[PDB]
């Protein structure tokens, strides 16, 4: 349940960002556009530098983001701000991959992000009410 829903949400946001075009998932998408576009514009210079260092240009470089995610969580801190930030950076990456015509890599990118989130944080997500907790955390 949670993996499928998380992948639907994350990949839809990533595809919409790269190409510029139930109720819980709709409001989660609505949240990602508001907060996630905000993070991207607020941190554009830092995100550019990060993408440069990581050098993500094809689908074997996609695993870089999952390594970044494990590193980010390795201090033992979990919160919705970090999760939305990681998805926002993923969207920043998918935007670049489409420009170099690596649309091949958009969904595998969304899958790697979802993989790390659900597998290493499954019970935290469930305890927090999943994507309903995400929406409420970032609500109005």
């Amino acid at each position: 349940e949670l993996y499928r829903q998380s992948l639907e949400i994350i990949s839809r946001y990533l595809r919409e960002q790269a190409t510029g075009a139930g109720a819980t998932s709709r409001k989660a998408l609505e949240t990602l556009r508001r907060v996630g576009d905000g993070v991207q514009r607020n941190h554009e210079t830092a995100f550019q530098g990060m993408l440069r260092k990581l050098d993500i240009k094809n689908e074997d470089d996609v695993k870089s983001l999952s390594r970044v995610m494990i590193h980010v969580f390795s201090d033992g801190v979990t919160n919705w701000g970090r999760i939305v930030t990681l998805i926002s950076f993923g969207a920043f990456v998918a935007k670049h991959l489409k420009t170099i015509n690596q649309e091949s890599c958009i969904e595998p990118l969304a899958e790697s992000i979802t993989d790390v989130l659900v597998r290493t944080k499954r019970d935290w997500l469930v305890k927090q009410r999943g994507w309903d907790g995400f929406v409420e955390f970032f609500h109005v």
């Binding site: 941190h43 260092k53 590193h71 980010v72 801190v77 919160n79 919705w80 701000g81 970032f138």
Partner: peptide, 13 residues
Amino acid sequence: AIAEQLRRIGDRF
């Protein structure tokens, strides 16, 4: 340092 920045951004919320 990439991790430290993403952590800082996220922990700001």
